[PDB]
Structures are given as C-alpha cells and as structure tokens.
C-alpha cells in the first residue's frame, strides 16, 4: 500500500514490536483529523493503514507511541512519542515508508519515497 | 539558561544556522501554548530560551522549522518540521540540551541532560 | 541468508543503489581476510553474500563504499567509506541485517539481529 | 586544537564519558599509523589531539572504543568499535569536530567542520 511504518529498537538491535501508531491528516480548518491507526507486527512493520484512493494530497502526521514501548520494557524514556509530519502526494501518488529507529533518549526517522 | 537547542546539518557538515525554533508548553486543556522561540546562531545553538523559574515540570514541545531551512538551501525536504516532545522532570538532571541532526529526508534528535 | 546489507540515501529519501560493499573476516593471524563482496540492487539491498555454513563465528568487517556513491552524484563527501565491524555467531547462528543511512557529511548504521 | 571528537550516549541521554578514542594516519604503505589518542571528558569531548602543524592533509581514521563503553555499563553491544575514516583538506574549512551518537546496536557520526 501507499503508507508503511517500520520501527526498530537500537538497544536490542531488533524490530520494535507492538508499537502503537496513529495517523492524522490536516483538515481544511487546520485541525488534526484522525486518518488511520495500527500497531507494528513482529517484523516491526505496520501495513494496510490506507489505500491509494483514500491517501489523497494533504499534510499528514504519523505519531509513534515510543513512550509506551519503552515503559513496557522497564525504561522511562525522554520523548512522549515520535511525531513525523509531512506533505504527501503533492506531485502525484507516491509510496511512503516512514522508518523510525528508537533509543531511550533519542530517535531518528527517515522517509523512503518511491514512484510506483 | 536550563533549556538549550543545538542543530546540525548532515549535508554540509556544519551547524544549522538561522533555523527557527519554537517551544510550546502543553496547557491544561491539551492545546500547545507558545513558550519561547528564536533562531539558531552561527554555532547552530539557541540559548536563553527560558529561566530556571519559568521552566517548571510539564510536557513541552520543541518545533524546529527544517522545511524553511532546506528551502533556503534549494533542497527539497520531506518533513514540515522536526517536533521533539518531552516531559521536564525536577528529579532528573537539570540542564536540557535538545540536539538535532538534519538531512532533507531524515532527522534525529537526542536529549543531552546534565547538571 | 545470514548476512544482508541495506543502504538508504537521506538526501534523496530513497534506497542507495549500486553501492559497492566488501566483507572481510579477521583471520587467526589478525589480518582482514576478504570474505565476500557485492553491490546493492535497486531496492538498496545486498543479498546472497554468504551461506549459513560459510558464515562461521568470527569478527567481520562490512565496508560500504559511500565515497564512490556520492562522487557519482556530484558530491564530495566527508567519509572515505562506512566500516561496520562486529563479532558474529558467538552464541550460535544468527541472521544479521546491516542497515546504513547516508548523507554527505554523516552516516548512521544499525544492526538488526534475529534468531532464525 | 584543530581536530575534536565529541561523543553522546543515546541510552542515558548524556555525554559518553571516559570513552577511548584512537586516531590513526594512513601511511605510504597503506597501514594505519598511530597518531593520537585519549579519553573523552565529562563533557564527552576530547581536545588537544593534535596541532595545526602536525595535522597535514591526508587520510585519517578515528576509532572510538564503543564496545568497552557498553561493557562498562552492563549492556551487550553489537560493534567492535565505531570507525570514522576521512580525508583532511587544506581548502575546506579548518576545524574538524567528529561527533558520534551511540546506542548498543547503532551509531551515527557526523563531521562538523568550521573556521
């Protein structure tokens, strides 16, 4: 599908499993509208969030609940979550992979954008 | 100056200069209330954002305007901005440095918390 | 297979294609012995470097030629290459994914280690 | 002090203190010749490695002993060390800061080159 989220754990050197992910889209009136949500699988991947038809142009926010992830492992992390905000499909439909790498006091995120 | 922000540019291998940074504090009703802002210096640093007195425990958001930074350099960016959201704790160490490393399609952020 | 290398481009937000990768293993006498080599595909991935049987315990070096990659794009980068050195299989056979994210003056690397 | 090394810990959100760092210079025969070394300070920084005079153009390797760092903290690390290899150029800016961010199974390094 057009939107994919992949999460890794930099401490354990593994996928980050069962991580809650919520997607929002900015509405005409400037609010964050709930768009889709899910949790990562054993492979640290979250597929099937949306479809080519539904995933129109817009500003989207992908919020990854990293705090709940770390807390369940006994760690009190720095960040409340990891928020990735971007404009999508402004030059036509694209496939987006939002990758996140997590550490207790650090995270990085990368976008992989391909033309289908 | 208990809260500091330091920004690096991974493409040019230098500090990210003149980058807009907005800090917000989560209000009782869950909306984001403007708290402080500024532009990174020639050293990619932003000091004097707040004081020990105003910097009370709570949830804060640091928003770094990476999009405008990349636009000024003529490079297509992916993100609207980089947002760092965290809880300030009186117990933990005291001085917060929010460090960020920027690329057009990627960014990383780290807390460096000391005394 | 047991060894996989994945490379992404943080500037273009894409896989890094045609990147040369050389693998070495530390010998009994302490030298770097050529073990395997290859180049990343269109997906920025390099598979088939070795086999479960061949990939024994040892200290391995994965050298990614990031300089040639950047130079072919018109960029003179900081690093000569990206070298990832690690001990493998000391607690039994594992599957290793060596991921690298490249920028002209920066790179990060992460290991994803799974028990097959 | 034209070459500097600064190391951060992504797990504890602090400087990486007492980390061994070895610098090498590539010799004519392609072997790595010891050049300078030290341990990061309380600020995670290592200054005074070399001088403007000894720091001539050439290929240098900075080796950071991340394995020993993680072993001291009781955390299983993946890498033997972090190696940063680069060419020093007289034309480019002059002061080199090799920054590194460390996690047990991941590290990033960035050049911050200024005047």
UniProtKB/Swiss-Prot annotation, chains A, C:
Changing residue 40 to A: In AMYLD1; amyloid polyneuropathy. Changing residue 107 to S: In AMYLD1; amyloid polyneuropathy. Changing residue 41 to R: In AMYLD1; amyloid polyneuropathy. Glycans are attached at residue 89. Changing residue 36 to D: In AMYLD1; amyloid cardiomyopathy. The modification Phosphoserine is found at residue 43. Changing residue 98 to V: In AMYLD1; amyloid polyneuropathy. It is found in: Secreted; Cytoplasm. Changing residue 49 to H: In AMYLD1; amyloid polyneuropathy. Changing residue 62 to A: In AMYLD1; amyloid polyneuropathy. Changing residue 101 to M: Loss of tetramerization. Belongs to the transthyretin family. This is Transthyretin. It comes from Homo sapiens (Human). The gene is TTR. The chain holds residues 30 to 145 of 147 of the full protein.
Swiss-Prot record, chains B, D:
It comes from Homo sapiens (Human). It is linked to Amyloidosis, hereditary systemic 1: A form of hereditary systemic amyloidosis, a disorder characterized by amyloid deposition in multiple tissues resulting in a wide clinical spectrum. AMYLD1 is an autosomal dominant form due to transthyretin amyloid deposition. Protein fibrils can form in different tissues leading to amyloid polyneuropathies, amyloidotic cardiomyopathy, carpal tunnel syndrome, systemic senile amyloidosis. The disease includes leptomeningeal amyloidosis that is characterized by primary involvement of the central nervous system. Hyperthyroxinemia, dystransthyretinemic: A condition characterized by elevation of total and free thyroxine in healthy, euthyroid persons without detectable binding protein abnormalities. Homotetramer. Dimer of dimers. In the homotetramer, subunits assemble around a central channel that can accommodate two ligand molecules. Interacts with RBP4. GO terms for cellular component: azurophil granule lumen; extracellular exosome; extracellular region; extracellular space; protein-containing complex. The modification Sulfocysteine is found at residue 1. Belongs to the transthyretin family. Keywords: Amyloid, Amyloidosis, Cytoplasm, Disease variant, Gamma-carboxyglutamic acid, Glycoprotein, Hormone, Neuropathy, Phosphoprotein, Secreted, Signal, Sulfation, Thyroid hormone, Transport. Changing residue 80 to K: In AMYLD1; amyloid polyneuropathy. It comes from the Eukaryota. Not glycosylated under normal conditions. Following unfolding, caused for example by variant AMYLD1 'Gly-38', the cryptic Asn-89 site is exposed and glycosylated by STT3B-containing OST complex, leading to its degradation by the ER-associated degradation (ERAD) pathway. Sulfonation of the reactive cysteine Cys-1 enhances the stability of the native conformation of TTR, avoiding misassembly of the protein leading to amyloid formation. The lineage of its organism: Eukaryota, Metazoa, Chordata, Craniata, Vertebrata. This is Transthyretin. The modification Phosphoserine is found at residue 43. Changing residue 60 to H: In AMYLD1; leptomeningeal amyloidosis; vitreous amyloid in some patients. Changing residue 36 to D: In AMYLD1; amyloid cardiomyopathy. Changing residue 36 to T: In AMYLD1; amyloid cardiomyopathy. It is found in: Secreted; Cytoplasm. Changing residue 26 to N: In AMYLD1; amyloid polyneuropathy. L-thyroxine binds at residues 6, 45, 108. Changing residue 38 to R: In AMYLD1; amyloid polyneuropathy. Glycans are attached at residue 89. Its main location: secreted. Tetramer dissociation and partial unfolding leads to the formation of aggregates and amyloid fibrils. Small molecules that occupy at least one of the thyroid hormone binding sites stabilize the tetramer, and thereby stabilize the native state and protect against misfolding and the formation of amyloid fibrils. Changing residue 49 to R: In AMYLD1; amyloid polyneuropathy.
């Amino acid at each position: 599908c057009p939107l994919m989220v992949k999460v890794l754990d930099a401490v354990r050197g593994s996928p980050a499993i069962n991580v809650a992910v919520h997607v929002f889209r900015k509405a005409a009136d400037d609010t964050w509208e709930p768009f889709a949500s899910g949790k990562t699988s054993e492979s640290g991947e979250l597929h099937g969030l949306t479809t080519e038809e539904e995933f129109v142009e817009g500003i989207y926010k992908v919020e990854i609940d990293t705090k709940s992830y770390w807390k369940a492992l006994g760690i009190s992390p720095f960040h409340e979550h990891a928020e990735v905000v971007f404009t999508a499909n402004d030059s036509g439909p694209r496939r987006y992979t939002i990758a996140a790498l997590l550490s207790p006091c650090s995270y990085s995120t990368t976008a992989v954008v391909t033309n289908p």
